[PDB]
Design a protein around this ligand. Structure first.
Ligand SMILES: CCCCCCCCO[C@@H]1O[C@H](CO)[C@H](O)[C@H](O)[C@H]1O[C@@H]1O[C@@H](C)[C@@H](O)[C@@H](O)[C@@H]1O
Ligand SMILES: C[C@@H](N)C(=O)NC[C@H]1O[C@@H](n2ccc(=O)[nH]c2=O)[C@H](O)[C@@H]1O
Length: 281
């Protein structure tokens, strides 16, 4: 489908968008910062495909308390103007708040078991996401965005993130050397990465992609976790450790800056962050 005529500022070849940060990876994946994209062009591209975005969130046991603000703020900031399908995974279907949705946006509640240990609640998201890719997501959305629930949207999160596979730079480590990254360092674990390997430390709280690529990632991580379990070992940062191993070996096609995953209480508001889009409560 052809784009219509649009009037916007000419991109200048001899003026970089950002002089302060890396905006492309060494494997030529964009790193998404404010100033790198014209959202008007991207909106047109994705609307012409009638794109549908799925957003998964787990609200198990006491984490149902976070849904109201998560969902209300998503309505303000997440893919506004596009088709969105929220998928709320919960052990308490009656506890999901009744949030008023904009046109072209729907919510489905998916009842799942609650594990006793929070580590397992966190980890088993991979199995559950993969199982639901297997039928539901394949037919209903084009992309899946998988996030933590104890968060709020404060600024635009849109189609600029969409790509076959993305990860997000963890806010605690975007300035760190790879030696300092908290990857799993025990060779006995499937998540093992040595001190001399690694591109970035990706956050387990924000990843996604096409349904096919997310199904692959989540299936791979769940299987790695099952091998670790049979061997009596649990990765240092659980699902996030396996995510990082996956993304080292299967490079993402975009990387999101820490604009997309932030904690203002712990880290302030650095000058390199022009927007805080999705933040810890
Ligand atoms: C020298 C650097 C010193 C600075 C360290 C700041 C980042 C620490 O971050 C924790 O990082 C862990 C991995 O190593 C896990 O991803 C954990 O979930 C995360 O805490 C989460 O995310 C955080 C951002 C906070 O919201 C915290 O409350 C969460 O539990
Ligand atoms: C680090 C921070 N986002 C966190 O506390 N947990 C990761 C997520 O896993 C899910 N979780 C975890 C423990 C729990 O008892 N319930 C739950 O839904 C929530 O979606 C959480 O956001």
């Amino acid at each position: 489908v052809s784009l219509p005529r649009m009037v916007y500022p000419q991109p200048k070849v001899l003026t970089p968008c950002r002089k302060d940060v890396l905006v492309v990876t060494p494997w030529l994946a964009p790193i998404v910062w404010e100033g790198t994209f014209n959202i008007d062009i991207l909106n047109e591209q994705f609307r012409l495909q009638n794109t549908t975005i799925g957003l998964t969130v787990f609200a198990i046991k006491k984490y149902v308390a976070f849904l109201k603000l998560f969902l209300e703020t998503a309505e303000k900031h997440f893919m506004v103007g596009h088709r969105v399908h929220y998928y709320v995974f919960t052990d308490q279907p009656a506890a999901v708040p009744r949030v008023t949705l904009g046109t072209g946006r729907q919510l489905s509640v998916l009842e799942v078991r609650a594990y006793k240990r929070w580590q397992d609640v966190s980890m088993r998201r991979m199995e559950m996401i993969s199982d639901f890719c297997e039928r539901r997501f394949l037919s209903e959305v084009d992309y899946l965005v998988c996030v933590d629930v104890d968060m709020e949207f404060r600024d635009h999160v849109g189609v600029e993130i969409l790509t076959p596979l993305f990860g997000t730079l963890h806010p605690g480590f975007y300035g760190s050397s790879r030696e300092a990254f908290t990857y799993e360092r025990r060779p006995q674990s499937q998540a093992y990465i040595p001190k001399d390997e690694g591109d970035f430390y990706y956050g387990g709280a924000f990843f996604g992609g096409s349904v096919q690529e997310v199904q692959r990632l989540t299936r791979a991580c769940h299987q790695a976790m099952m091998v670790d379990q049979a061997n009596g070992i649990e990765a240092v940062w659980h699902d996030e450790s396996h995510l990082n191993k996956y993304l080292l070996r299967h490079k993402p096609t975009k990387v999101l800056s820490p604009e997309y995953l932030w904690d203002q209480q712990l880290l302030g508001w650095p000058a390199v962050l022009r927007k805080l889009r999705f933040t810890a409560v």
